[PDB]
């Protein structure tokens, strides 16, 4: 009896941990997207700056 109880507890623990894992996965990919976007914005502002000369 007690053996099987401990087994089920280990199961639920692994479950919650992987829940955290997936959530953080999506967050990090979204951060990747945002960093790309800000890169493009930086360049665009920079070209306008350079066109401010003539």
């Amino acid at each position: 009896w007690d053996e099987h109880d401990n087994r089920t507890r280990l199961a639920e623990r692994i479950d919650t941990v992987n829940r955290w894992k997936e959530t953080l996965d999506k967050c990090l990919t979204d951060l990747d997207a945002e960093i790309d976007s800000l890169a493009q914005a930086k360049e665009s502002a920079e070209q306008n700056l350079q066109a401010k000369n003539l």
């Binding site: 992987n18 997936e22 996965d25 999506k26 990090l28 990919t29 979204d30 990747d32 997207a33 945002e34 790309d36 976007s37």
Partner: protein, 32 residues
């Protein structure tokens, strides 16, 4: 094929592409 994939192991180091499906929170419409 098109069949059940577990969208779980999903950290490609740099997928800054028209890819990385499901949730992205990218922008929908862009400059023009």
């Amino acid at each position: 094929f098109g069949a059940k994939l577990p969208w779980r192991s999903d950290y490609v180091p740099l997928l800054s592409l028209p890819q990385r499906p499901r949730f992205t929170a990218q922008d929908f419409r862009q400059r023009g």
